[PDB]
Amino acid sequence: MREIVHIQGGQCGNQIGAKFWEVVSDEHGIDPTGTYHGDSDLQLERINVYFNEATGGRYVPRAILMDLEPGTMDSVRSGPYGQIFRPDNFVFGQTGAGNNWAKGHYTEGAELIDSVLDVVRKEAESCDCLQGFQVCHSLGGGTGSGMGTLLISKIREEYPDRMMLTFSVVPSPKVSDTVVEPYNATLSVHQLVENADECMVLDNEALYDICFRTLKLTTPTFGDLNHLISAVMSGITCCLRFPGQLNADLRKLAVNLIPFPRLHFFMVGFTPLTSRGSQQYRALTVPELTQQMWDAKNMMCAADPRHGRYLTASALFRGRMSTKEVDEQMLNVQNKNSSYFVEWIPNNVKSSVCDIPPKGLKMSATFIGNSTAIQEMFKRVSEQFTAMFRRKAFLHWYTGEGMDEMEFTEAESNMNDLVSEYQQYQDASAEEEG
Amino acid sequence: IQGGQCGNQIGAKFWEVVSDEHGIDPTGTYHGDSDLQLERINVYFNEATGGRYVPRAILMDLEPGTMDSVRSGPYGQIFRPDNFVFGQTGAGNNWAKGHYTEGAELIDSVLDVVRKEAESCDCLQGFQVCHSLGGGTGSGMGTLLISKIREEYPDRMMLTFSVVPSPKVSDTVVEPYNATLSVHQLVENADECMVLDNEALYDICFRTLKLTTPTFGDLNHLISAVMSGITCCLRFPGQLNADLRKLAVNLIPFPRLHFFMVGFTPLTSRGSQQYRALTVPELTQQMWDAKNMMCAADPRHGRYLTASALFRGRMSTKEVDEQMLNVQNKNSSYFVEWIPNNVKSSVCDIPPKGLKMSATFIGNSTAIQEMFKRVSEQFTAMFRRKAFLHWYTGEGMDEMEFTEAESNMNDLVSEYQQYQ
Amino acid sequence: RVDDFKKAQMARASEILKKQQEEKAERDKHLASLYRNKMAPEFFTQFGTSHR
Amino acid sequence: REVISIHIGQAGIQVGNACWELYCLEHGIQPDGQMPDAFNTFFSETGAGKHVPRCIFLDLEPTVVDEVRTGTYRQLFHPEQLISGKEDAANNFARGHYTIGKEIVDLALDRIRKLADNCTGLQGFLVFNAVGGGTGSGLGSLLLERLSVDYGKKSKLGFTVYPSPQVSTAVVEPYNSVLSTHSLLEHTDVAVMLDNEAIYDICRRSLDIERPTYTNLNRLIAQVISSLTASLRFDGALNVDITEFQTNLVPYPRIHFMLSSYAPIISAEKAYHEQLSVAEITNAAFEPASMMVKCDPRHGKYMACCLMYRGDVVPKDVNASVATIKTKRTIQFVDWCPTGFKCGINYQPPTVVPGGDLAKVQRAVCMISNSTAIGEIFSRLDHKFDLMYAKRAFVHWYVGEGMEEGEFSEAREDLAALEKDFEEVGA
Amino acid sequence: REVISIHIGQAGIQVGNACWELYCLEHGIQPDGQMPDAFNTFFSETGAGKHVPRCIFLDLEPTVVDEVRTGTYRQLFHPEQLISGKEDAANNFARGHYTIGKEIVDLALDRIRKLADNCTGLQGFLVFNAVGGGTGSGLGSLLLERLSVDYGKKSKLGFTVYPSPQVSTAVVEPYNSVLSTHSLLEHTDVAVMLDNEAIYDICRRSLDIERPTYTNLNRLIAQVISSLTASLRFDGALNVDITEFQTNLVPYPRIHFMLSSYAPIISAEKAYHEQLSVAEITNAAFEPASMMVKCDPRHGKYMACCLMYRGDVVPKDVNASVATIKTKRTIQFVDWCPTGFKCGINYQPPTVVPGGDLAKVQRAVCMISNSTAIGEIFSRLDHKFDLMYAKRAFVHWYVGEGMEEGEFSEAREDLAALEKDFEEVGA
Amino acid sequence: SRYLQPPNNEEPWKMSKFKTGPKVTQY
Ligand SMILES: Nc1nc2c(ncn2[C@@H]2O[C@H](COP(=O)(O)OP(=O)(O)OP(=O)(O)O)[C@@H](O)[C@H]2O)c(=O)[nH]1
Ligand SMILES: Nc1nc2c(ncn2[C@@H]2O[C@H](COP(=O)(O)OP(=O)(O)OP(=O)(O)O)[C@@H](O)[C@H]2O)c(=O)[nH]1
Ligand SMILES: Nc1nc2c(ncn2[C@@H]2O[C@H](COP(=O)(O)OP(=O)(O)O)[C@@H](O)[C@H]2O)c(=O)[nH]1
Ligand SMILES: Nc1nc2c(ncn2[C@@H]2O[C@H](COP(=O)(O)OP(=O)(O)O)[C@@H](O)[C@H]2O)c(=O)[nH]1
Ligand SMILES: [Mg+2]
Ligand SMILES: [Mg+2]
């Protein structure tokens, strides 16, 4: 029936995919060796969206992994739940991009993306009703950003009507790992604004802040951050895999969240997230879910929605609830904070309910916010880009491989028009027409 | 002849009462005591086989609901299934059904049934129709059959115990349209029409009977008792006889003036039954009371053209005549001047079972035209704004029919007014 | 006899109403536990499971 | 006198679940499909000892349909009457009206053809759908269009669900509502609005349910449907059929929008002390606090009225109640409708379902009225459709799937003309 | 013959608790709701074996209201009649008359609408409240205004609790009392004041209880109301209903201000020892030491008087007692009413509540007269109103809640006109 | 003042396309 494929690009994408497949395998009741050993029948009815039945209850994940250096693939194989992935889905080269968008987009991607296309097309035709593609990757690296964007472009060229999600992490100044982050990020955004159906912006700033303040973990390694991202993706997909009182597919969320085709950049959060020593003190009710859902410090981007307006919003709910409480909480939050919601769209919020909660919980929530304050990140990256690009810094690593300055100018211009369009839609006059 | 839901229910109660009065059980067998019961059975029943009597009735409507309700209850086993003229689409209180959109395929089978039923008897004394007046098929099949019947059989009498659109609250929103059109057909084709309404029945159950929950059973029992009182003299002897034609010729001074306001007596509560007497004055005073009539027409607001009083039981004719003369003389202002002796009396020596005395009143007065103007005004208000017209006009006719009927109803108001 | 029939029916109907009252009170207590969130110890073991 | 019902959308078939549960418990039909003769209007005697309902559950997302196929009533419903697609319309009247509807409309239609062919005394069709969604609004309108062109004069009662003024579940209900009402105006014979916020208010106030769910709402809707169908199914003192509401409540072809209210909605504790009488239950059906649509009829004028009575009700009491209502000036009628009532009485009291919260009662009233506050409802929805249409927001989806702007404009002007009609008629 | 009683404020509904306890005890109604035809005027018989009072409790704070909801009389009262707000007026006429009362007044009045719809022979309303508070003064006056507008002709008695001359529990109570009396004039039909210090003195002297509380005061007030409505409830040799208070005791439209007295108020031992004939119980009811308003009638003139008798009372003895009262010159009547008495005789003796202090009495007298000391009471209150109004004290609260100085001034001059009226009538 | 504010009754604005008339026949 409805089908979702997972695509992982680069080291970050591979680790996030590993964590996501771990949590999904736990949710659907399959063991690390690939066979089903669950209890209820609800764990069999909707596993076709992620698994193919091979032999004797063997379910192989419907994923395609990507990289350019063997270390990531070997780490994926050696970890737990590493014996479920099909070896043929490891489309792969062994040279390495090396934090270079041009290397992963023109020199190395050009020969490996054909094998990627073979694998992904065999996968996409291996299903009956493909619901959409799902890609997770980075925008700072070379083999995840460049090759990932090229795959996005090729897939959008081949399958135009299918859906497309992108869980893309963006660089941020407080934690900058490499030096050429703006060069990769600007061109990656230039590609995504034209190819991706919708984007969900992530960054390690908000993940680290969530772990430090909310979870209060001593040592928030990448495992916790990948777990948070995986929980976000699972709560995004939950509606398809389990029955509920109100269903909402990815297309429904996209049409209820995107008012204009270029406004497809969302800021996301998860609820609840509390410390083990502090979970005793707190009440466990739906208002506690909603109140932490709307909090700015719970968001997973380094952009405060308080600095802008909410264009549209969506909330994904899991577990048995009363629709009355959800609806009244949404109405209350929408009516009280009246200045943070754009005026030419009444009822900016979409809601849905699912009857199956994630492991360890009885109820949870996932929030999608299409805000006009997201262009803060784009400006914050473009300033570093135009400061670095002023005197052709690190440029020979790109022009010495085929690119020209015109690509950089076009990426900068596109990013600037995107932020200008977001700004104009923020302060758009409420009640007029021309 | 009965049409629609109201017609079916009143006919069921009427046949119940009549079958008990002639002493036949609900299985259709005679079990009476006196020999006076058998000699005039043929006026209502036919002997089939082995002493079984079937009513000379034609049950006929558009929906199976009323027929099922009639058949399921007691005395539902006496009706011959062949007389069950029967449609399948429904009425829905709709004009359309009843003269050009849903009734013609039934008007013909009922025509065959009534023809076979009327040719079976040797001297048909007349036709009697009990039907609703605010419905779709109760009016529709009923008085369309009245129309075709008059063409085939002009001399025979036609009696209609119609239930006029409910007066203060309306069962049907489109009640003015259905009532006005039915009355135009009735004035031209029906020989004599008894006017009824549920308001007077509800008031009677309020005050005289003092019942708590008077369902349609009691109202239909009242109407059936009135019917039996009207048709009593045909079945039993008496000191002074009078059939339907007697009343028609002594009650109708002009051919268009044949709407009657009707009452029945005695009607006493079971708590007040121990306190009343049983004499001719006790019948006359209760009969002439305005709060006893079965129509929303106050006789004090108009003039009595002619009146009739059919008495039942062993009684002195002198007392009846002197009571009629006294009531005529004391209320001298309510009786028309150019016509003396406005009342006719007839005596039958057989009363209803369990009683000694009874009387039924028929009064042709110009106070009933109050109801005609009340309905006409409601039609004009709706017709001016063309409300609900689409349900009727698109169903197969023209607005001219609406206009002609309103004008004739208006003329009927004026002629009654002339003799006021 | 009619009046005694009415008194029997209302007494019968009153018994159903009282039984309905107890059933509703049971449902409200049941919904309190079902609609209340709670965290299992297996949820907290998800964090800090890898060094990286 | 068989009536067949079609349920379009995730909202329609949950209402169908509640309605068919009520019908099965009311006619004594076990969930396996057989009794331990009035059932013919809802169930057809197939073979010997088996009853199959006269309904079709049609939807695009198959999760709820296969949940129905999996749960308790596996044997009652037959798998050929439950139509389910592969992909959703995704809150898009456009998608379900042009892309996905055109392939699923024909199968449901040729199933309903034989469903009606089985019937002998077919009264009409009646629909359940929510115009806020994509499948209920999108292909529901197409199915209504093709039913109208295939049958024409047969009744098509509309029990639709309109979005609440303030309570909302998505962002694009104005577009879907306008584009569905544009065709429902000229194809639905009689349409009854149902709002989710009003039923929430009724549950909080009357049934004192602190945390209600859609199941209670569906149960109340099923109670209303059973109350308006009981006179067809059961004998009464004064029974009415489906064709009544067309003639007695629709003075003009383009004005068919009926406000619904039910009385009494009362809980077990609250029913323990109120001496239920025809007078007070008639009174409680007229106040806006007991209506199923979030609108106030005091701002308008009543155009028609239909009253349904169930249980221990005599014509005397309804006469007195209606007369007393008419004497008081708290409510007012339009000057060209002097007689605007349509009363009906049924014998059997409403059956009480185990697990329901409504207390068993001796009498109840169901109301179907017509006023001009519907012109306030449509203007209120028109404001928030107009705000979005000002800057052409979300219309790219509709245009891209296969619509064009002209359909938006013509629907907008159709609702504007309906507004002018509503304010002209009430003069 | 039916009467519906409304209780406004904390004092009003505590008095209501006492009154309805006595009402349930006297008619043999268990607190659960059912007995183990006199009850008609206070209770309504629902279904089979269940009686509901014809009353509403309304208040702005929920503490006392849900204390009533929690106590023994839980199943007797039913959740519809106990109106409860969220925040109180907090000793402020303006708050409860303009800000908070506007939202709670409609619910009380449309509950009263259906309460009267249940009734058929409504004698009239009667109110229980205190003018010293905020809720009882402001929105109580608003409810009286709207009741006078909606119904008009029906009777509206008032049993208010005016502040004591020297004993007080509040500071801004002169403002509340004056502003409540300004609207109480043209709306209340008959006003019977009940003062707190007077009943305290009655309890200290008659019942010799050193440490009384509000419950004893409420018990005595409830006994007075019961002895006042026993004529409607029970058969007597010479009965007198509610409508006779207006005609026989109100000589002028703006002079409706009544004293109340009761006799005998006795303990068990004193009841055993001393005989209770008609003569002394009539004599004791006329001394100022047995009055429920702290005023002395010897400072004024008796304009009218009403007498209620219960138990073993024959007309000859009440005639002799009223004659001896008339001839004694310690009290003087006005010249203008040569026959200024209204006697009423009932057969039912007053009932006793177990746990109380009043013993079983063969015969009792409840007197309601009209005098000129009302002018003294109002002048004494007006003087200390004007003293505190001189320095603009506490006025900012009232102005902020939505008032101004115009109504202050007009209330001042209205009580001045009342003073002039009471002075001229006594001459 | 929030409690004491007078209510307002105005249609909350639409396009300039107010020109369309009723589809019903006028009377
Ligand atoms: N009254 C009532 N309304 C419901 C119920 N379930 C859903 N709805 C309404 O249905 C509307 C949206 O339609 P859906 O239920 O999602 O199903 P749909 O109409 O096919 O729309 P799609 O999501 O495109 O499939 C919402 O606005 C709800 O108010 C229900 O059980 N009762
Ligand atoms: N006689 C009598 N008076 C009472 C009783 N309870 C309260 N009062 C009076 O009520 C006055 C104060 O008003 P309350 O009734 O307590 O409260 P309120 O009328 O609702 O006004 P707010 O407290 O401002 O909301 C006091 O001066 C008391 O004299 C009582 O039980 N008996
Ligand atoms: N959230 C998350 N971020 C990661 C992970 N691994 C690497 N990153 C981030 O990705 C950036 C480097 O990207 P890189 O691994 O070189 O991308 P690649 O070249 O496509 O493999 C660094 O700034 C890291 O912070 C991971 O497992 N989770
Ligand atoms: N007296 C009496 N009147 C009835 C009865 N049944 C219906 N009516 C009246 O008939 C009118 C409605 O007619 P209706 O049943 O719709 O006619 P039909 O649809 O053609 O069968 C109402 O005004 C009722 O007062 C009955 O049993 N007895
Ligand atoms: Mg849906
Ligand atoms: Mg208080």
TrEMBL record, chain C:
Compartments in which it is found: Cytoplasm, Cytoskeleton, Flagellum axoneme
Family per similarity comment: Belongs to the RIB43A family.
Subunit structure: Microtubule inner protein component of sperm flagellar doublet microtubules.
Designated name of the protein: Flagellar protofilament ribbon protein
Species assigned in the record: Chlamydomonas reinhardtii (Chlamydomonas smithii)
Gene name, Swiss-Prot/TrEMBL: RIB43a
Residues of the full protein shown: 316 to 367 of 367
